[PDB]
């Protein structure tokens, strides 16, 4: 638990690292070359091409806050695995209390 | 072995193995057991062959057997068959790892200074290996002895 | 024949080889910080707290450090009635946060041997970030509240290790409070009644 | 200049040792190693001591450490005697 | 005993030197903030009768076995001595802040205090907390961040005198440990 | 080729060629009949392998052909397919030489300097060769597609 | 051994704990009263490890490097046909270089 | 620097005996997987830059080693990483072909953890990068080939630890 | 800085500093008052210098922000401006250090390896710094714009 | 190898923040003494041989290290001294200009006391030579400049001790 | 690298005194044996290969270091021995002429036992080879000349131990 809480403080520190530029690029005019209107040839990027969408969809997004978020999901998997292991250990300790 | 030569030779250029080299590993591994089947044939004929090697190395060179020569005496001749046994054992290694390094990292590199500090005439040892290759042809059929022929004459080329 | 002879060969030589053993540039033999302490058999809680807290990566580095690693009798001496107030809360498993600074106050950038502290009082901040005053007078070298026990231990990267008698707490370190209950106000009318109205602030009402 | 101009694979100068050394780097290691020649028995050159301990620079430690293992050497100990750690500016 | 002027004399006697131009910039900067140092000693000695009761009673509410019978603050004569060495230590630290060097601290206050407190049976770890509350108070008074009495000052940086008085209490707290 | 660098390898080492080197020159020349058939398939399929090669390249990288892309207009798009005809030609050389040595010193050595100096996205031309690879391996059996595709991905590796 | 079929599921009930609450009745209780336990066994019923796991290193082979010269630490298959014995024996060696047979 | 055949020949030679049935039994086991290793080393050569780009973005791309003060901040320091991760993915490819991890400690592992401590490189983040790089390598070469290539990654991670 | 490499220059040559080196350390420190004013202008104009910097960058390179571009979406565009905030910061270091030594070992050494390994078009980030340069030199007089622009174009040169 | 500006930029960069008022406050303090350091380094370059000739004649010229058996007897050994003292007066000049003693331990102090113990060079006489050399350096550059140049001499003497 | 005359001159010079009667007394003792050492170094140069061939065949020729697994098995490893034994018989010849073993530890002994431990060369068999080589050297040069040449062999064996 207390290394999952250290992962959440690193996600909060990674967003404050980029928040002067995340809001500074929020009122720029970023016009692409293709991909939005269908009158321009986009090629592969009409949607996405041939298997490159991923197992989830968030794994194809790059960034400092997406990369520490995948660290959180692998760290919360190991906490939830061992929190469900103390449940059936507590069942067997109470199941052996009905014989004395 | 052969894969080791490709990993090394590709490692000094800081690159993965190219298209041609991966052929050289793939073709070598597909001819795998036939070396394995062949070495078991030769291991069952080591007492076969070294007895035949002592046939002609000494009828060709009675200088070494005679009193005064290096191989004169029982215990000198005793290891004499042992050197054939190690060489024949080395060739089974070379026939398996399909190249010359087990015949070169052992046996060949610095062999002359070994023998010259021993008194064994280095020209006589060349005929000993040539005698050993002459002996391996009889207990081996025509199919597989030219598979093992290039491993012998490398030793003769290494010793000169 | 002079006692302090020298090194070298050829003429103008004193019969002693170069470097006293024929080696000009001697390969070192010390280990690094944390396993020079692991071999000592006295810094057991110190090396273990470093490994758990992640500070041990910092004092792995090659920078010339002057560690003031307390022997575990110092850690065993943390059962003051006083010092247990400000340090017992770190025993909780979520408070690794303060444990790194409190341990990072024991690392000093630089190689300050005790012989280099001949009646000299020089301060410095740690790698924790706050100043510490090293204090060598009357051959009693002090590091905050250290009162160093063993003089120096030569380490790998030109680093030094001094054994201290206690644990140095950083100056502006406040102890973390114990885990508490998030309390909420039961009513809302006991709090509108707790706020002074504008007519109260001008003295118009009692 | 430095060894990271943009060279990588498929570039005109040959693919080689690329060190992360800055402009005129002033960091240097103190290394210790044995490096048997493995080539004297067909060259017959004179013999030289193979156990050396010397200060190699940071600019060329990686090439040297990459090469000491090329010829079967073993590195007994290395340290960063001169230079800082995590230092953005000042390695020059 | 020495001061900050005569510490660099007996350092310059160790090299058989004259006190030349290299060392006088250390001392002319010392008299440059000489008005700052006297503004730091005056914050200590004006609350010094109240800091000693603030610090000894903070030791009691942490380690209450001293006032327990058989303890070391139980007898009322034995309590009045513990208020005395709270302020004799504060008398010798304030001389060390005044002189600028801890020689008079390490030749008169700590000269045998360690074998005193063993032979009186005084608990040494509570003598650390009697000293170190006065460390945390004097760095609050000199930085003027004491939370219930602010003194008037010409404004500016003072953090070197704060760490200097924190360095003198650690030489007390290490010499009696 | 495998013949020329198996020589220059043993050339530098002051020695002849081992059985490991001469049983592969032997193994390569018996492979030569099958190599010319594979290169013969790609030789007169360049109309489809290139034109369908640039098919998927634009449908995957519309930026390079869109206005502002390097291969924009009737002109650059023709040269946009010209380079693919080059690299498809070099793969036919590598298949017959049994190595990327022809592809090495033509189209690979210093390729990043050219395309960086032409303003062309080098990653874009790497995408073009991958699109040609799926068209090429779709024209051959599995035993051949492990070769013809094998030389493309080496070109993909060196081109980034 | 589990030889306690004399002791059932009703071992540690501790029937005689008795609380008088004054001069009235004895108020008999069967509270189980566990110990200051801890049940000292290793490798329990589950894994309890979610990632953060590359701890495995080979054992030290002395002066060579680990797992390199295991040509002395193997079994064997054969020995050869002639094989003159040693007669000087000079101690068994620690693997007789960091170089292998195939140097 | 020994492959599976070199290690088998060495152990059979170090006792002075021929290649018996047990020595050839492992050699036949290596030749059976010879077809799998080349195709594994084939695709890894193709997707070398793509694998390293996937590992760093999945393990340590946005962590605060990437930010200022972290161990990977400056562009020289960032560029040293992908140079550094290239060796792990490359030398692991050599171990996968040779079938023996002797080349790793010969040319990678020795003086490695002693070098990162000198530079102050975080060994913790390094292993997780290799673990993430091992995870993507199992994507390309398949399951069993990933088991083979993965068997040398953790060998690096174990000794580097 | 000019102080540290004028030292390490004369350090390597086994000599002290010449008048040519010491009349410029002298000339640089008297220049130090004017340098802090110039860096003080860029320090609290990063809101406009960066945001207008990415203004012209997207108008000149819509591919990088269009769908498929590296800086596509709300996420990458924020990091798209983050790097410009980095390089604008390093120029403030170079102005105060009187040299690109801070910009050299931060953001320039091995920069092509990073951006090639991130998939970012290195030419695109070079276009971003040029757009920041016109905004920066528009904030200062002619005597200053010959400096603040002077450090940007060095970053432009090393970034391609 | 950092000057005062490099050290100020490093500490302000290592936290990822800009150059605030405190970082520029020290930088302004360094630029104020920029005029003093050059003139200090000016005269020291002129009187380099004269300063070293004054120090050795004032500290260790006639002591019995100079006589037979002493550590400085032979002409090679005597000539090594003034070569050796030249570095201390030279590198101290670099620290006086850079305003940071990082260059000393980077290029002088590391492996220095460990080297003199190998040769058997007396560290006691060495420091007194540098102390006497510090005394004459305060003669030339003045009082405060001598305080600056003197601040790096004892830094050498401290670490060399 | 000092001979008997160099060592005598050094000790007489290191006290700054002339060559008195005691210093010349040893020098006359060295010149008396000057005729013996050259003839000793004469025959050793002639029978260099014969002496080394006699030592290895008498000490470690048939022991199991010579057999597989032993420290001397491969031909490169065997050839390194007689190359290695040549230095001991050669440098001992230099010490016999110079009359001072300073050249041995200067050029042979330093880093030698630390090198054999690295390679894993058995120091026990090495000394017995030199002892056997010392035994044959007393055969050629005679008794007293063998006492002289033998006096530097065990000096190598002592320090190499
Ligand atoms: C920072 C240092 C630190 C400590 C000193 C302890 C202090 C402490 N103890 C408890 C909490 C508790 N403390 C006790 C202990 C006792 N109750 C008794 O009647 C006995 C006399 C005595 C034991 C000898 C009990 C029984 C609980 C309830 C929770 C539990 O049993 O686990 C709590 C949780 C508060 C709450 O939720 O109510 C805290 C902070 N924990 C810390 O983290
Ligand atoms: C010049 C140096 C100098 C000092 C530093 C002080 C300290 C000091 N205190 C006492 C004497 C004492 N000192 C203490 C003090 C304490 N016990 C505690 O539990 C607390 C931790 C601490 C108070 C803060 C007590 C309790 C006595 C009384 C012993 C007694 O009366 O028998 C004595 C012995 C004097 C005597 O009783 O005859 C001395 C030397 N006085 C000095 O002259
Ligand atoms: C259980 C009993 C108990 C106490 C009595 C207090 C005692 C106390 N006060 C302070 C801390 C302090 N104590 C004082 C002392 C004083 N303030 C003044 O203005 C006067 C001069 C003097 C009282 C006469 C000062 C000035 C500080 C610093 C902060 C401040 O109060 O402004 C500290 C150190 C910090 C800490 O550990 O919390 C302690 C232990 N705390 C306790 O836990
Ligand atoms: C409700 C629960 C309950 C109890 C716990 C006992 C308690 C108890 N015991 C006695 C009364 C007594 N208790 C004792 C017992 C003893 N006296 C001794 O001196 C011995 C040390 C000890 C023997 C072990 C004796 C001897 C008497 C008096 C004779 C008797 O009443 O039996 C009385 C009556 C006292 C009176 O008359 O006021 C009571 C209430 N009885 C109860 O009804
Ligand atoms: C101080 C020197 C320095 C630089 C420059 C630097 C760059 C840097 N740029 C990054 C990402 C990135 N950079 C971009 C940049 C761009 N996209 C575009 O279209 C434009 C052409 C361009 C910006 C003008 C994008 C899109 C990412 C995220 C890529 C991904 O998520 O895969 C990352 C990874 C995430 C992070 O940790 O921030 C680093 C480290 N680090 C440094 O230390
Ligand atoms: C693995 C490679 C390898 C080889 C070959 C090897 C050889 C070797 N041959 C030796 C001796 C000898 N070898 C011979 C050999 C011969 N006389 C003849 O007429 C023949 C042509 C020839 C044998 C076929 C003789 C006579 C001696 C004894 C010489 C003596 O000691 O007087 C010795 C000295 C000890 C011993 O006999 O074991 C070695 C080490 N060592 C090795 O490691
Ligand atoms: C072939 C076996 C082998 C390896 C592995 C090797 C590593 C090696 N890594 C180095 C640096 C480095 N390595 C890193 C790596 C990292 N930073 C992080 O945060 C990550 C955890 C990690 C990437 C996975 C960095 C940032 C440097 C530069 C350190 C500096 O400039 O101080 C250096 C210093 C010289 C240079 O890069 O030119 C060497 C020699 N050398 C070898 O011969
Ligand atoms: C045999 C090895 C080999 C190659 C590869 C080669 C390439 C090459 N490509 C060129 C141009 C070009 N190449 C392209 C290519 C592309 N535009 C895109 O959008 C795509 C990403 C990419 C093609 C798939 C364009 C647009 C030009 C013209 C650039 C200009 O006109 O400025 C030119 C200059 C004109 C010419 O002489 O053809 C050469 C020499 N030469 C060689 O000898
Ligand atoms: C001039 C002073 C001096 C000496 C003495 C010296 C020794 C030295 N002996 C070496 C190896 C060796 N030395 C031996 C020696 C022996 N094996 C045995 O069983 C015997 C006990 C012993 C013969 C007496 C062997 C077998 C090797 C090769 C080790 C290997 O390939 O791993 C090597 C490694 C490189 C090489 O030979 O090219 C050096 C440097 N170098 C010097 O500069």
Secondary structure (H, E, C), J25-91? HHHHHHHHCHHHHHHHHHHHHHCHHHHHHHHHHHHCCCCCCCCCCCCCCCHHHHHHHHHHHHHHHHH
Structure tokens at B97: 């790892």
Task: List the one residue out of C74, J13, J150, I82 whose CA is nearest residue E17.
Answer: J150
Total count of residues recorded for chain K: 161
Cα four-point dihedral sign F26, F27, F28, F33 = positive
Task: List the one residue out of H105, H96, H91 whose CA is nearest residue H159.
Answer: H105
Quote the CA–CA distance of H121 and I54 in Å, as a whole number. Answer: 34
Quote the CA–CA distance of H141 and H133 in Å, as a whole number. Answer: 13
Quote the CA–CA distance of K64 and B142 in Å, as a whole number. Answer: 39
Buried b (16+ CB within 10 A) or exposed e, B58-97: beebeebbeeebbbeeeeebebbbbbbbbbbbbbbbbbbb
K57: three-class secondary structure by DSSP = helix
Identify the helix (H) or strand (E) that includes residue G17: strand G17-18
Number of domains composing chain E: 1
Quote the CA–CA distance of A42 and B104 in Å, as a whole number. Answer: 61
Q: What is chain B's Cα-based Rg?
A: 18
Q: Which residues pair with C164 in a beta bridge?
A: C70
Total count of residues recorded for chain H: 161
> What's the Cα-to-Cα distance from D83 to each of C190, C194, D79, I91, rounded to whole Å?
65, 62, 11, 25
Q: How far apart are the first and last CA of chain F?
A: 24
Q: How far is the CA of E1 from the centre of ligand 8 (A)?
A: 86
Q: Is the CB of F69 under 6 A from ligand 8?
A: yes
Q: What is chain H's Cα-based Rg?
A: 18
CB K74 within 8 A of CB G103: yes
Identify the helix (H) or strand (E) that includes residue G28: strand G28-29
Quote the CA–CA distance of B111 and G79 in Å, as a whole number. Answer: 23
Report the relative pairing of strands D51-57 and D74-82 from DSSP bridges: unpaired
Coarse DSSP helix, strand, coil percentages of chain F, rounded to the nearest 5 percent = 75, 0, 25
- Binding residue numbers of E for (2R,3E)-phycoerythrobilin: 82, 158
Q: In the block, which residue shows the tokens 């106050």?
A: C105
Neighbours of C121 (CB within 10 A): 20
Classify the phi-psi angles of C169: left when phi > 0, otherwise alpha if psi is within -120 to 50, otherwise beta: beta
Neighbours of J28 (CB within 10 A): 11
D40 Cα to chain B: minimum distance (Å): 10
Structure tokens at F29: 């020349």
Quote the CA–CA distance of A68 and H65 in Å, as a whole number. Answer: 11
Report the relative pairing of strands C66-67 and C160-163 from DSSP bridges: parallel
Q: How far is the CA of I83 from the centre of ligand 5 (A)?
A: 6
CB G54 within 8 A of CB H154: yes
Q: How far is the CA of F124 from the centre of ligand 5 (A)?
A: 20
Neighbours of G38 (CB within 10 A): 6
B14 close contact with D: CB closer than 8 A: yes
Task: List the one residue out of J145, J129, J57 whose CA is nearest residue J97.
Answer: J145
Structure tokens at H118: 């000198």
DSSP state of B89: H
DSSP state of G29: E
Phi/psi at I17 (nearest 5 deg)?
A: -95, 135
Total count of residues recorded for chain I: 160
DSSP string spanning chain C?
--SS-----SSS--S--GGGTS-SSPPP----HHHHHHHHTS-HHHHHHHHHHSGGGTTTSSS-BEE-PBPHHHHHTT--TTHHHHHGGGGSTTTHHHHHHHHHTT--BS---GGGGTTEEEEEE-SSSSEEEEEEETTEEEESS---SEEEEE-TTS-EEEEBSS-PPPTT--PPPPP------S-SHHHHTTSPPHHHHTTS--
G18: three-class secondary structure by DSSP = strand
Identify the helix (H) or strand (E) that includes residue B107: none
Quote the CA–CA distance of B2 and B9 in Å, as a whole number. Answer: 10
Q: In the block, which residue shows the tokens 């758990």?
A: C52
CB < 8 Å to K69, chain H: 14-16
Q: How far apart are the first and last CA of chain J?
A: 22
CB I2 within 8 A of CB I98: yes
Neighbours of I12 (CB within 10 A): 10
Q: In the block, which residue shows the tokens 């591919």?
A: I63
Task: List the one residue out of H121, H90, H122 whose CA is nearest residue H107.
Answer: H90
Mutate to test the interface with D, among J15, J98, J106 (most CBs of D within 10 A): J106
How deeply is C26 buried, as exposed, middle or buried, from its count of CB atoms within 10 A (0-12, 13-18, 19+)?
A: middle
Chains that touch D (3 or more CB pairs under 8 A): B, C, F, G, H, I, J, K
Phi/psi at C160 (nearest 5 deg)?
A: -120, 150
A76 close contact with C: CB closer than 8 A: no
Interaxial angle between packed helices E76-99 and E34-45, expressed in degrees from 0 to 180 and rounded to the nearest 10: 170
Which residues contact residue K109 at a Cβ distance below 8 angstroms, ignoring those fewer than 6 apart?
Answer: C22, K156, K159, K160
Stated in angstroms to one decimal place, the resolution of this structure is: 4.3
Q: How far is the CA of E50 from the centre of ligand 3 (A)?
A: 10
To test ligand 9's pocket by mutation, which of K57, K78, K119 has the most ligand atoms within 8 angstroms of CB? K119
Quote the CA–CA distance of B29 and H38 in Å, as a whole number. Answer: 10
- Binding residue numbers of K: 71, 76, 81
Q: What is the dihedral of CA F41, F43, F47, F53, to 10 degrees?
A: 80
Neighbours of C63 (CB within 10 A): 22
Structure tokens at K70: 């032993």
CB I46 within 8 A of CB A23: no
Nearest CA to ligand 6 atom 6: B83
Identify the helix (H) or strand (E) that includes residue I82: helix I73-97
Q: Is the CB of K109 under 6 A from ligand 9?
A: no
Mutate to test the interface with K, among H6, H10, H16, H18 (most CBs of K within 10 A): H16
H65: three-class secondary structure by DSSP = coil
Q: Is the CB of G19 under 6 A from ligand 4?
A: no
Contacts of range F27-33, beta carbons closer than 8 Å, 24 or more positions apart: F27/B27, F28/F2, F28/F3, F28/F98, F31/F98
In the F/H pair of chains, how many CB contacts fall below 8 A? 14
Nearest CA to ligand 2 atom 17: E122
Q: Over chain D, what HEC string results?
A: CCCCCCCCCCCCCCCCCCCCCCCCCCCEEEEEEECCCCCHHHHCCCCCCCEEEEEEECCCHHHHHHHHCCCCCEEEEEEEEECCCCCCCCCC
Classify the phi-psi angles of G67: left when phi > 0, otherwise alpha if psi is within -120 to 50, otherwise beta: left
Quote the CA–CA distance of I131 and I56 in Å, as a whole number. Answer: 6
CB C170 within 8 A of CB C178: no
Which residues contact residue C80 at a Cβ distance below 8 angstroms, ignoring those fewer than 6 apart?
Answer: E63, E125, E126, E128, E129
Quote the CA–CA distance of F22 and F35 in Å, as a whole number. Answer: 19
I69: three-class secondary structure by DSSP = strand
Which residues contact residue K106 at a Cβ distance below 8 angstroms, ignoring those fewer than 6 apart?
Answer: C9, C17, C22, K1
Task: List the one residue out of B35, B32, B40 whose CA is nearest residue H28.
Answer: B32
Contacts of range E22-28, beta carbons closer than 8 Å, 24 or more positions apart: E22/J134, E22/J137, E22/J138, E22/J143, E22/J146, E22/J147, E22/J148, E22/J149, E22/J150, E22/J151, E22/J153, E23/J147, E23/J150, E24/J143, E24/J144, E24/J147, E25/J143, E25/J144, E25/J147, E25/J148, E26/J147
Quote the CA–CA distance of K97 and K3 in Å, as a whole number. Answer: 8
Q: Which residues pair with K29 in a beta bridge?
A: none
Neighbours of A23 (CB within 10 A): 13
What is the distance, to the nearest Å, from the Cα of residue F120 to the centroid of all Cα atoms in its chain? 19
Q: How far is the CA of C178 from the centre of ligand 1 (A)?
A: 10
Total count of residues recorded for chain J: 161
**In chain F, at which residue ranges do the beta strands (DSSP E only) sit?**
none
Phi/psi at J71 (nearest 5 deg)?
A: -70, 25
Neighbours of K147 (CB within 10 A): 12
Interaxial angle between packed helices J123-141 and J48-59, expressed in degrees from 0 to 180 and rounded to the nearest 10: 130
Total count of residues recorded for chain A: 100
CB E124 within 8 A of CB E63: no
Quote the CA–CA distance of I130 and I135 in Å, as a whole number. Answer: 9
Quote the CA–CA distance of F6 and F10 in Å, as a whole number. Answer: 6
CA atoms within 13 A on the CB side of F59: 10
Q: In chain K, how long is the greatest CA-to-CA distance?
A: 61
Structure tokens at F73: 């207009």
Cα four-point dihedral sign H111, H117, H123, H129 = negative
Q: Which domain holds residue E63?
A: 1-177
Identify the helix (H) or strand (E) that includes residue E22: none
Structure tokens at H7: 């290690």
Structure tokens at J5: 């500006």
Q: How far apart are the first and last CA of chain G?
A: 56
Quote the CA–CA distance of J136 and E17 in Å, as a whole number. Answer: 10
Classify the phi-psi angles of D38: left when phi > 0, otherwise alpha if psi is within -120 to 50, otherwise beta: left
Q: How many helices (H) and strands (E) does chain G have?
A: 0, 2
Q: Which residues pair with D28 in a beta bridge?
A: D57, D82
CB I105 within 8 A of CB I93: no
Q: Is the CB of F127 under 6 A from ligand 8?
A: no
G4: three-class secondary structure by DSSP = coil
Which residues contact residue B125 at a Cβ distance below 8 angstroms, ignoring those fewer than 6 apart?
Answer: B111, B115, B159
DSSP state of B66: S
Structure tokens at K10: 């050094």
CB C63 within 8 A of CB C109: yes
Task: Please list the alpha-helical segments (H only) found in chain B.
Answer: 2-11, 19-30, 32-43, 46-60, 62-65, 74-96, 101-104, 111-116, 122-136, 142-159
Structure tokens at J93: 């000049």
CB F120 within 8 A of CB F137: no
What is the distance, to the nearest Å, from the Cα of residue G8 to the centroid of all Cα atoms in its chain? 31
Quote the CA–CA distance of F141 and A2 in Å, as a whole number. Answer: 56
Structure tokens at F129: 């060769």
Give all strands of the β-sheet with C150-154 in edge-to-edge order.
Answer: C66-67, C160-163, C150-154
Tell me the CATH number at E45: 1.10.490.20
CB A88 within 8 A of CB A96: no
How deeply is K107 buried, as exposed, middle or buried, from its count of CB atoms within 10 A (0-12, 13-18, 19+)?
A: middle
CB contact under 8 A, F109 and D9: no
Interaxial angle between packed helices F32-43 and F142-158, expressed in degrees from 0 to 180 and rounded to the nearest 10: 70
Quote the CA–CA distance of I142 and I136 in Å, as a whole number. Answer: 12
Task: List the one residue out of E135, E87, E65 whose CA is nearest residue C82.
Answer: E65
Which residues contact residue K143 at a Cβ distance below 8 angstroms, ignoring those fewer than 6 apart?
Answer: none
CB C27 within 8 A of CB C33: no
Quote the CA–CA distance of J100 and J3 in Å, as a whole number. Answer: 5
């Amino acid at each position: 638990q207390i290394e999952l809480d250290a992962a959440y403080t690193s996600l909060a520190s990674s967003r404050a690292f980029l928040a002067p530029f995340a809001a500074m690029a929020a009122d720029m005019d970023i016009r692409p070359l293709y991909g939005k209107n269908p009158q321009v040839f986009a090629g592969q990027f009409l949607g996405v091409g041939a298997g490159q969408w991923g197992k989830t969809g968030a794994d194809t997004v790059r960034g400092r806050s997406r990369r520490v978020a995948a660290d959180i999901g692998v760290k919360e998997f190991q906490l939830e695995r061992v929190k469900q292991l103390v449940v059936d250990l507590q069942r067997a300790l109470a199941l052996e209390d009905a014989e004395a | 072995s052969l894969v080791t030569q490709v990993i090394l030779s590709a490692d000094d250029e800081l690159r993965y193995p190219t298209a041609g080299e991966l052929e050289t590993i793939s073709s070598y591994l597909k001819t795998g057991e036939y070396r394995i089947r062949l070495i078991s044939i030769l291991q069952g004929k080591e007492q076969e062959i070294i007895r035949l090697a002592s046939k002609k190395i000494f009828q060709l060179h009675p200088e070494y057997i005679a009193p005064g020569g290096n191989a004169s005496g029982a215990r000198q001749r005793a290891l004499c068959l042992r050197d054939y046994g190690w060489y024949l054992r080395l060739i089974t290694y070379a026939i398996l790892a399909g190249d010359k390094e087990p015949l070169e990292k052992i046996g060949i590199i610095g062999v002359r200074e070994m023998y010259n500090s021993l008194g064994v005439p280095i020209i006589g040892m060349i005929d000993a290996i040539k005698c050993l290759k002459e002996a391996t042809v009889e207990v081996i059929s025509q199919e597989e002895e030219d598979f093992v022929a290039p491993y012998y004459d490398y030793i003769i080329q290494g010793m000169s | 024949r002079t006692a302090y002879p020298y090194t070298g060969s050829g003429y103008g030589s004193a019969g002693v080889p170069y470097g006293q053993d024929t080696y000009g540039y001697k390969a070192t033999t010390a280990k690094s910080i944390t396993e020079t302490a692991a071999q000592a058999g006295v810094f057991n809680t110190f090396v273990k707290l470093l490994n758990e807290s992640g500070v041990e990566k910092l004092v792995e580095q090659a920078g010339p450090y002057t560690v003031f690693a307390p022997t575990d009798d110092a850690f065993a001496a943390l059962l003051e009635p006083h010092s247990f107030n400000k340090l017992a809360t770190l025993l909780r498993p979520e408070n690794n946060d303060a444990l790194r600074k409190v341990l990072m106050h024991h690392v000093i950038p630089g190689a300050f041997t005790s012989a280099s502290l001949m009646d000299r009082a020089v301060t410095v901040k740690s790698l924790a970030g706050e100043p510490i005053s090293i204090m060598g007078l009357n051959k009693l070298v002090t590091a905050g509240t250290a009162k160093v026990v063993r003089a120096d231990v030569p380490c790998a990267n030109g680093c030094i290790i001094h054994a201290v008698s206690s644990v140095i707490i950083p100056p502006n370190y406040v102890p973390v409070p114990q885990p508490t209950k998030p309390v909420f106000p039961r009513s809302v009318i006991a709090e509108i009644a707790k706020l002074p109205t504008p007519r109260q602030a001008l003295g118009l009402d009692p | 200049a430095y060894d990271m101009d943009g060279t990588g694979a498929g570039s005109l100068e040959p693919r080689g040792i690329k060190s992360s050394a800055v402009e005129k780097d002033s960091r240097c290691f103190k290394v210790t190693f044995v490096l048997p020649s493995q080539s004297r028995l067909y060259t017959f050159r004179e013999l030289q001591n193979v156990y050396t301990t010397k200060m190699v620079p940071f600019s060329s430690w990686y090439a040297e450490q990459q090469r000491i293992q090329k010829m079967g050497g073993k590195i007994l100990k290395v340290e960063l005697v001169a230079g800082g750690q995590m230092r953005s500016v000042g390695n020059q | 005993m020495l001061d900050a002027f005569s510490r660099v004399v007996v350092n310059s006697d160790a090299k058989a030197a004259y006190v030349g131009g290299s060392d006088l910039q250390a001392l002319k900067s010392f008299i440059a903030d000489g008005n700052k140092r006297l503004d730091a000693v005056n914050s200590i000695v004006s609350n010094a009768s109240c800091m000693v009761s603030d610090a000894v009673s903070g030791m009691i509410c942490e380690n209450p076995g001293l006032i327990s019978p058989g303890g070391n603050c139980y007898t009322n004569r034995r309590m009045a001595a513990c208020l005395r060495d709270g302020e004799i230590i504060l008398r010798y630290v304030s001389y060390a802040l005044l002189a600028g060097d801890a020689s008079v601290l390490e030749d008169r206050c700590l000269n045998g205090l360690k074998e005193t407190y063993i032979a009186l049976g005084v608990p040494t770890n509570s003598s650390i907390r009697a000293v170190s509350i006065m460390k945390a108070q004097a760095v609050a008074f000199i930085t003027n961040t004491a939370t219930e009495r602010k003194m008037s000052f010409a404004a500016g940086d003072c953090t070197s005198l704060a760490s200097e008085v924190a360095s003198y209490f650690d030489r007390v707290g290490a010499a009696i440990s | 080729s495998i013949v020329t660098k198996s020589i220059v390898n043993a050339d530098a080492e002051a020695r002849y060629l081992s059985p490991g080197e001469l049983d592969r020159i032997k193994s390569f020349v018996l492979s030569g009949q099958r190599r010319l058939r594979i290169a013969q398939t790609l030789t007169e399929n360049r109309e489809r392998i290139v034109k369908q090669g640039g098919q998927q390249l634009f449908q995957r990288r519309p930026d390079v052909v869109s206005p502002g892309g390097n291969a924009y207009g009737e002109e650059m798009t023709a040269t946009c397919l010209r380079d693919l005809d080059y690299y498809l030609r070099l793969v036919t050389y590598g298949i017959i030489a049994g190595d990327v040595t022809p592809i090495e010193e033509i189209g690979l050595v210093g390729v990043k300097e050219m395309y960086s100096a032409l303003g062309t996205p080098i990653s874009g031309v790497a995408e073009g060769i991958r699109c040609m690879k799926d068209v090429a391996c779709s024209l051959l059996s599995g035993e051949d597609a492990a070769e013809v595709g094998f030389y493309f991905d080496y070109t993909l590796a060196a081109m980034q | 051994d589990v030889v306690n079929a004399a002791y059932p599921k009703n071992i540690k009930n501790k029937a005689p704990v008795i609380s008088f609450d004054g001069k009235k009745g004895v108020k008999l209780e069967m509270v189980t009263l566990q110990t200051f336990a801890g049940d000292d066994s290793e490798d329990t019923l589950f894994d309890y490890s979610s990632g953060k796991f590359m701890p495995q290193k080979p054992a030290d082979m002395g002066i060579a490097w680990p797992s390199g010269d295991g040509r002395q630490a193997e079994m064997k298959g054969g020995k050869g046909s002639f094989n003159q014995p040693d007669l000087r024996k000079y101690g068994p060696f620690p693997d007789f270089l960091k170089r292998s047979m195939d140097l | 620097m020994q492959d599976a055949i070199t290690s088998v020949i060495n152990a059979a030679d170090v006792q002075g005996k021929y290649l018996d049935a047990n020595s050839v039994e492992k050699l036949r086991g290596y030749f059976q997987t010879g077809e799998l290793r080349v195709r594994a080393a084939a695709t890894i050569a193709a997707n070398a830059a793509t694998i390293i780009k996937e590992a760093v973005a999945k393990s340590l791309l946005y962590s605060d080693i990437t930010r200022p003060g972290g161990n990977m901040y400056t562009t020289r320091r960032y560029a040293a990483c992908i140079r550094d991760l290239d060796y792990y993915l490359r030398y692991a490819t050599y171990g996968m072909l040779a079938g023996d991890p002797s080349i790793l400690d010969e040319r990678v592992l020795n003086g490695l953890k002693e070098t990162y401590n000198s530079l102050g490189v975080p060994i913790g983040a390094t292993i997780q990068a290799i673990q993430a790089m091992k995870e993507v390598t199992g994507s390309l070469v398949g399951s069993d080939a990933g088991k083979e290539m993965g068997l040398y990654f953790d060998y690096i991670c174990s000794g580097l630890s």
